[PDB]
Amino acid sequence: MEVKTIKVFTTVDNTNLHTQLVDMSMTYGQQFGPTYLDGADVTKIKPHVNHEGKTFFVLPSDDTLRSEAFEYYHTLDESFLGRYMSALNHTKKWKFPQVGGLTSIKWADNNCYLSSVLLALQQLEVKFNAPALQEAYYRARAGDAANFCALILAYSNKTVGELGDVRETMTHLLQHANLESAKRVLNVVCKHCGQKTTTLTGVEAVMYMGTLSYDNLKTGVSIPCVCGRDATQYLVQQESSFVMMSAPPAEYKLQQGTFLCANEYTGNYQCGHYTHITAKETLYRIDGAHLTKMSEYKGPVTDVFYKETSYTTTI
Ligand SMILES: [Br-]
Ligand SMILES: [Br-]
Ligand SMILES: [Br-]
Ligand SMILES: [Zn+2]
């Protein structure tokens, strides 16, 4: 005969708050659907008096929340908020030490691929379209990356603990970056057939699988011609702030003054592990919270990043 309530706020973006009166005799789940407090799932709990005035994250369940979720995350999937919160409940527990002047991630839950992605991004000029990513990234660069890591996992449909691949993760993450002005032009030349250019834009303009060497794209890559002879594919225009060269792991030597940063993959499956290498006053090998300085590195490199502004040949 009496409904006892506490006033709380619900939100999907942490800026637009919606006042709610929650009945203390019912769970949060019964009233709001899946609910989270500071990332912890409180769906099955009934309101505590001390929850008064606190802000809870909920799934976008009405027009207003859906619009707020889209504007902030650029997502239409209602479950996104749940997967983000689920991941954040874990990543908020991770440690993000400064290692060699960069924000790294202390090893946990097979997060070494995420640590490599984060280390590389900090060294590139890149900006994201979604406010949520932009903001989370600003924080990660400063040394606080729990939110950024959870968003990466949520956007890529991977869970904490799941094995990851740097190239695949970067690909999915760069699809959320503003690469509108990224452009690559290749010229394929055959002694007998002639020449033809291929233009690529966006993510495809900055990534390449097959060789770790940016110089190799410039010198030319052998390719089969429709006729049957061997043609040469040359990079003739590259307009981007960086390029990422990838290849299946194989012994490769990284030398100072020739690249921006890179990562190597040692082992397979349960023993597979990534470490990052960056070029500073000397080479730095960043392995989670561990730093090793060396004049050169030879190991199973799988991705190498290079800085760029504009590269063009006569064609
Ligand atoms: Br998760
Ligand atoms: Br940004
Ligand atoms: Br470079
Ligand atoms: Zn030909």
CA of residue 222 to ligand 4 center, whole Å:
12
Would you tell me how many other CB atoms lie within 10 Å of the CB of residue 57?
A: 22
Map tokens 């190799």 to a residue.
216
Task: Read off φ and ψ for residue 299, nearest 5 degrees.
Answer: -175, -170
The technique by which this structure was obtained is X-ray
Task: Find how far residue 251's CA is from the centre of its chain.
Answer: 26
Would you tell me how many other CB atoms lie within 10 Å of the CB of residue 51?
A: 19
Residue type, 308: E
**Which ligand gives the minimal distance to the CA of 224?**
4
Domain 59-182 has CATH 3.30.300.100: no
CA of residue 192 to ligand 4 center, whole Å:
5
Locate 160 and state its tokens: 């904490």
Q: Which fold has domain 183-315?
A: Jelly Rolls (2.60.120)
What residues are labeled active site?
112, 273, 287
What's the rounded Cα separation, in Å, for the pair 187 and 185? 7
Q: What dihedral angle (degrees, nearest 10) is formed by the CA atoms of 304, 305, 306, 312? A: 90
For the structural domain made of 1-58, what CATH number should be given? 3.10.20.540
Q: Which regions of the chain carry the CATH code 2.60.120.1680?
A: 183-315
CA of residue 120 to ligand 2 center, whole Å:
14
DSSP secondary structure string, 232-283?
EEEEEEEESSEEEEEEEEEEEEEETTS-SEEEEEES-GGG-EEEEEEESSSE
What's the rounded Cα separation, in Å, for the pair 56 and 9? 6
What's the rounded Cα separation, in Å, for the pair 286 and 116? 9
Q: What dihedral angle (degrees, nearest 10) is formed by the CA atoms of 239, 240, 245, 246? A: -120
CA of residue 138 to ligand 2 center, whole Å:
7
Can you point out the beta strands (E) in the chain?
5-11, 18-23, 35-37, 40-41, 55-58, 98-99, 102-103, 183-190, 194-201, 207-209, 221-224, 230-239, 242-255, 261-266, 273-279, 283-287, 290-294, 296-307, 310-312
- The annotated binding site for Zn(2+) is made up of 190, 193, 225, 227
Q: Which regions of the chain carry the CATH code 1.10.8.1190?
A: 59-182
Task: Find how far residue 287's CA is from the centre of its chain.
Answer: 18
Locate 20 and state its tokens: 């709610």
CA of residue 166 to ligand 2 center, whole Å:
20
H runs (alpha helix) in 40-79: 63-73
CA of residue 147 to ligand 1 center, whole Å:
12
Q: Which regions of the chain carry the CATH code 3.10.20.540?
A: 1-58
